[PDB]
Amino acid sequence: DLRLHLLLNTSVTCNDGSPAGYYLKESRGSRRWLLFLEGGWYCFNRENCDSRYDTMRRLMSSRDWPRTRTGTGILSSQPEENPYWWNANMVFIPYCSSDVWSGASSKSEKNEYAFMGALIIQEVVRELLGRGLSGAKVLLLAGSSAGGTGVLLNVDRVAEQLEKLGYPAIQVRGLADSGWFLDNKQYRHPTEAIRRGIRYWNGVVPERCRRQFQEGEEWNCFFGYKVYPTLRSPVFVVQLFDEAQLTVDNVHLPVQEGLRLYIQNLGRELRHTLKDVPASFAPACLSHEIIIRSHWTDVQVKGTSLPRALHCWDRSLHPLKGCPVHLVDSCPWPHCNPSCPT
Ligand SMILES: Nc1ccccc1OCc1ccccc1
Ligand SMILES: *[C@@H]1O[C@H](CO)[C@@H](O)[C@H](O)[C@H]1NC(C)=O
């Protein structure tokens, strides 16, 4: 169980103006800190956000949040469930801003909703420094789905925040799970929704990526293969046949030739975008998310599991014999890897 803390600065808020927060379980014998960003799609205009407020309200408000949450997967404290970081300080940051963690705009007489994802992350970091984060050696910013894209947009800002506050010895790193998407052609007839959302949210993207693509084109920085080369912090990417990617591509699974080629080309393109990413784990499976699932230990690429690959990453940041960090499947069809989830 991680315990809820609502933010002391009550001007940093969920969509509806209620306080944002975080769930914490401390481990005083450890200098490692794991901050996990929840996902859950997004909303991009007044009518679409009103719909979400009716039937997905925990993703827009803290009013009904429980006082505790169970840590699962990489957030478990049990070595059998979490071979990687079972002894770490654990933080779960709920997603209540509907802005893929990019916003910095308050509720006002002009704005029915507040979109403060980027500021929520900053304020969680700032309040944690008083509860032990000041003594950390490593801060791992992790996240799944919209939270995985949120890692890519925020990891370098966290590094900058800690340097300017006077903690230059804390090593900031990122782990982006199921947040690496392609702006490809649909199978039957996305970038428009992000382009509209960014204006609706006052969304912010990393500075080097913003300077490459310039005004009006910041939406490009929500796509992993375009924003990742601009990042300075070390980032491990977990992603080949992602179900959210296929949903936006209008693919629903006796497969004819046209769809067979479409699916095989998608896997080849994903593989291509990861060729020059040295810390990555990309199995040939149809699935979505992995790192907070209890059975995240079962899947393997080339004989190496995800917890092992992350441990090898840690060792590399002190090539390694028998402990690889770049693991991408080469076979071309979903589930050609025998260890894919059932
Ligand atoms: N909405 C969004 C949010 C984050 C990153 C990209 C995004 O574009 C939409 C999208 C395109 C392809 C596959 C999945 C989603
Ligand atoms: C509370 O958060 C807001 C938004 O980031 C900021 O303007 C303000 O400085 C914060 N308050 C304090 C006391 O730090």
Residue nearest atom 14 in ligand 2 by C-alpha distance: 9
Please tell me the distance from the alpha carbon of residue 85 to that of residue 140, in angstroms, as a whole number: 11
Ligand 1 mutation target, pool 181, 245, 269, most atoms within 8 A of CB: 181
Domain with 342, as residue range(s), is: 1-342
CA angle 102, 74, 236 (to 5 degrees): 55
Q: How many helices (H) and strands (E) does the chain have?
A: 9, 14
Tally of CB atoms within 10 A around 65: 18
Question: What are the residues whose beta carbons fall under 8 Å from the beta carbon of 19, sequence distance 6 or more?
Answer: 6, 7, 10, 12, 13, 62
3-state secondary structure of 33: strand
The two structure tokens encoding residue 163: 């340097």
Residue 238 in contact with residue 178, Cβ under 8 Å?
yes
Sign of CA dihedral 122, 9, 91, 40: negative
Number of structural domains the chain divides into: 1
Ligand 1 mutation target, pool 115, 186, 194, most atoms within 8 A of CB: 194
Instruction: Evaluate: CB of 125 within 6 angstroms of ligand 2.
Output: no
Resolution of the experimental model, in Å, one decimal:
1.6
Check the chain for breaks (C–N over 2.5 Å) and list the residue before each, or none. Answer: 189, 239, 253, 318
Instruction: Evaluate: CB of 12 within 6 angstroms of ligand 2.
Output: yes
Question: What are the residues whose beta carbons fall under 8 Å from the beta carbon of 219, sequence distance 6 or more?
Answer: 191, 194, 195, 198
Please tell me the distance from the alpha carbon of residue 209 to that of residue 205, in angstroms, as a whole number: 7
Please tell me the distance from the alpha carbon of residue 207 to that of residue 209, in angstroms, as a whole number: 5
**338 burial type by CB count under 10 A (0-12 exposed, 13-18 middle, 19+ buried):** exposed
Residue nearest atom 7 in ligand 2 by C-alpha distance: 11
Question: What are the residues whose beta carbons fall under 8 Å from the beta carbon of 280, sequence distance 6 or more?
Answer: 236, 237, 238, 239, 274, 325, 326, 327, 328
The two structure tokens encoding residue 76: 């478990």
